[PDB]
């Protein structure tokens, strides 16, 4: 009976561990999603004004 209680406790501890792992992975992908898609600054616009030929 005590070994069955120990098995239940070990499963609960592992479940809390990957719960906290799930939270930090959610924050990791939430700052992953904002860093791919691109926007052009004024440095992309300023070169097409220069040059008069």
């Amino acid at each position: 009976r005590q070994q069955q209680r120990l098995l239940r406790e070990q499963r609960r501890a592992l479940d809390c561990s990957n719960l906290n792992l799930a939270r930090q992975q959610y924050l990791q992908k939430k700052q992953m999603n904002t860093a791919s898609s691109s926007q052009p600054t004024e440095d992309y616009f300023s070169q097409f004004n220069t040059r008069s030929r």
Partner: protein, 426 residues
């Protein structure tokens, strides 16, 4: 250790070469006097591909500057970046070529080709493993097309196994500014076909067509066409200088592109071109580069690839991206339409990915397509060469330099075979 020696000739050559070196220097953090003022460290890691070394942290480019008059060498030295070029690298005559092919090729250029060949042999013997050369010239001129095909014939007999790349500006007949332009262009394509490993065909009409339509510039100028050419001249060499997840140098892009040795005329295109007004309406992703990379209103040649069949296709990406979204869009464009893609090649598209994006953008791309629809550029030159030549229109300017009429005859039949070498795959 994979150096590239840059050569350019003519007013068209030295006005693209002046703007190209403005783009590389910004991308490696070089000031207008030659001192490194960057912020990261990967800019300084492989600077020797394009730049030499001097005293006190001064990087002078490996570029050679050729003209037949001193009138366009002074607008190079009086620009913003004119003080970074080594003064010995300017090689210039005293009387011009006069929009004549033969003076560039026999009379005035033959006494000058042995002075440039001293300069390029000084710099090719200072590289540990020279990757190849480049040219940037004009076929509608006298020293770009006459002497520029005399260096190519003389370089390829001395360094024959390297890469000989060109960015030729072929003439356009809708916006044409020289009467004797069909004579220069016909006599040069006969010389490009056997002596270049690659050749990118650029038309000035198809560069005006982008600034009016895509970039919405109300005043396009030659200083703004030279930035479209220079942006795709550095997009093909971006994996020799920066690390990536799938590299591609110049030789790898020629293995997967030319199936037969005489079929090497490409058509460039640059992906994220955006106006000032329509800037905020676009979320630039991998799907929104491959819709503009492949569009027929984007090609830098005045020929439509909806009339032909893509033999092979390149794609060179920049920016930190995902290799699955890049790879599913190249498969997607092949499978929707199988009339425009040839059948004896089962996968036509070659992909490469770099990591360091250009200045001011966070993602970019480059298209290098090998189309059968480039034959409508040589046929349209050759209907105006033989409209003139049956009457012998302007021929006394050329035969009086020491030519023959057979040189016009042999360089007309040999270019009409390149039409009928492409004509058997469409």
């Amino acid at each position: 250790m994979r150096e590239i020696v840059h050569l350019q000739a003519g007013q068209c050559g030295n006005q693209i070469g002046a703007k190209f070196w403005e783009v590389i220097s910004d991308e490696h953090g070089i000031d207008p006097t030659g001192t490194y003022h960057g912020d990261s460290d990967l800019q300084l890691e492989r600077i020797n591909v394009y730049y030499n070394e001097a005293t006190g942290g001064k990087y002078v480019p490996r570029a050679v500057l050729v003209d037949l008059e001193p009138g366009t060498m002074d607008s190079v030295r009086s620009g913003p970046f004119g003080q970074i070029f080594r003064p010995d690298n300017f090689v210039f005559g005293q009387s011009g070529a006069g929009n004549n092919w033969a003076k560039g090729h026999y009379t005035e250029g033959a006494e000058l080709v042995d002075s440039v060949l001293d300069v390029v042999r000084k710099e090719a013997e200072s590289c540990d493993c020279l990757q190849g050369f480049q040219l940037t010239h004009s076929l509608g001129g006298g020293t770009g097309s006459g002497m520029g095909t005399l260096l190519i014939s003389k370089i390829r007999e001395e360094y024959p196994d390297r890469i000989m790349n060109t960015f030729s500006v072929v003439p356009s007949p809708k916006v044409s500014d020289t009467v004797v332009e069909p004579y220069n262009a016909t006599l040069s394509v006969h010389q490009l076909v056997e002596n270049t490993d690659e050749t990118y065909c650029i038309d000035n009409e198809a560069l005006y067509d982008i600034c009016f339509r895509t970039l919405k510039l109300t005043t396009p100028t030659y200083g703004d066409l030279n930035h479209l050419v220079s942006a795709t001249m550095s997009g093909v060499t971006t994996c020799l200088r920066f690390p990536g997840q799938l590299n591609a140098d110049l030789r790898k892009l020629a293995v997967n592109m030319v199936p037969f040795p005489r079929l090497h005329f490409f058509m460039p295109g640059f992906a994220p071109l955006t106006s000032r007004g329509s800037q905020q309406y676009r979320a630039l992703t991998v799907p929104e580069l491959t819709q503009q990379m492949f569009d027929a209103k984007n090609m830098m040649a005045a020929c439509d690839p909806r009339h032909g069949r893509y033999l092979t296709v390149a794609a060179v990406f920049r920016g930190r991206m995902s290799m699955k979204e890049v790879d599913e869009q190249m498969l997607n464009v092949q499978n929707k339409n199988s009339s425009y893609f040839v059948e004896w090649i089962p996968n036509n598209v070659k992909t490469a990915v770099c990591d360091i994006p250009p200045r001011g953008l966070k993602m970019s791309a480059t298209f290098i397509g090998n189309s059968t629809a480039i034959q409508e550029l040589f046929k349209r030159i050759s209907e105006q060469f033989t409209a003139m030549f049956r009457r012998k229109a302007f021929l006394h300017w050329y035969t009086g330099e020491g030519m023959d009429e057979m040189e016009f005859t042999e360089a007309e039949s040999n270019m009409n075979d390149l039409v009928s070498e492409y004509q058997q795959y469409q």
